[PDB]
Symmetry: D3
């Protein structure tokens, strides 16, 4: 296993419906090995002077690091927001079989 | 985009009220671009020889990596706990406009 | 603090019961300083032709990076799934006292 | 000190004269704090399936990681080779004063 | 470019002849894009209780990070020393064309 | 092998005499497994707004990453310059036996 060659990408969505549709798509298109959805999220950010709170859903998408650009482009079309949160974190170590599986199902 | 110049910091809180107070403060103080709150967390650790379980709330704070020390100091200063969990994970890749936005709103 | 010498490892479980059992074990065995359990997770993956959805629980395990191989072996052994998700993400910066604590409670 | 916010960039040159010109330029332009020149290098690469050996000089350029794109653009512009070797390696730890100095003289 | 997907590997050799043989081989076998040889090295380490000084030559081998294990195997197998120094350092940023070239000639 | 748990630290010295003295000391004190000296270096930096060129020697010091702070403290203490260049680069991959050896001889 090459350190950081698999990544865990985080994507924020407005609701569960959208998150599922994106999640299903990225897997079906082989852009990700799998996705975890974390619901009941409260996002806190500053907008036009004031601080806003919204209900959101968070995706943890596990994929090859080489696919992150392609994953990001896809998430950009489908347009959850004008500017979509996509951040990829590199996996330094882990369960080799599983890490090999994430590669095998995205080649 | 410089790899790892934006970070995702994780902070554990005793409840939603405290997590929201801290979240609103770090954004208002420009120490973070935004905060995701993940509720209904069960924390499992050892204390006085026994293994404890607590209800907690988890913050995923997205900010510049250069601000993490300042972020930590602030959280230290206001957090209820004697020793606050603050761990920062570097963002290797992502949506450039979003990554640019995180920098823009924290300069 | 040496950058990346503490890691946050993520492990997916079928349910709360199993997640708690594994969480308690890794702490008791000093393989992790602490574990956060994130419930009500929906996992989306391909199940041999179909796209599947399951209810799962997610563990965020905080430990020394040197212990991740030992943590994985243990999880491997007692995990239901044939192939367990264990992914470790390195902590670049943080609260030094806390980072020191994670090391203190996992030394042997 | 933020890990990896200073980098050590390596640049290959055909000879000492060119390396010095580039080295002096990047420092005068504040794109680097300083440059170490390693002479008497033998470079070994293929080209049309045949293996070449050339005399080269290697630069180790120490600078902010945020300046690496700007550094690379400049080196592209003045380097005799069509495709210039510029590779940046991040500095995880070091002498803080010196790391602080590299930042101070490139701001 | 995926951060850290190209590496610069350093290998220590007893002399120029050996270093060149190994260098030519790894390039010919497509295990590396190119190799820089840094001569006139003095190595300082402890041997049988006393501190030794040897004349050595240092290789900086630029290749895909995915190839480092294969590179190491080859070197370990051919290298004079029982335990060969092979250390790989990841390239976080650089000249994209050149980084693309390193991949192209090693696929 | 834990990625980045061994580091290659670079230290600049005014001449070979000093470099050898420091190199011998860090090895004898178990702060490093071994040191490569790269001589005939030309350093280019700015000083009182004027660009200087000096003859220097470069050390590549291979050690545990956990020891880098202790290594730096020692170097700062024996090093002639007021502000010593010490930069540590993490080793992501390599020859495991050798990586194991660097740890063995510095425990
Ligand atoms: Na990597
Ligand atoms: Na030639
Ligand atoms: Na590390």
């Amino acid at each position: 296993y090459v350190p950081g060659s698999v990544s865990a990408a985080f994507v924020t969505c407005p609701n569960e419906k959208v998150a599922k549709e994106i999640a299903r798509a990225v897997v079906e298109k082989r852009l990700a090995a799998c996705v975890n959805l974390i619901p009941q999220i409260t996002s806190i950010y500053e907008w036009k002077g004031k601080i806003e709170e919204d209900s959101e859903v968070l995706m943890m998408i596990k994929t090859q690091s080489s696919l992150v650009p392609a994953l990001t482009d896809f998430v950009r079309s489908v347009h959850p927001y004008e500017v979509a949160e996509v951040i990829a974190l590199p996996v330094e170590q882990g369960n080799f079989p599983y890490l090999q599986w994430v590669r095998q199902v995205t080649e």
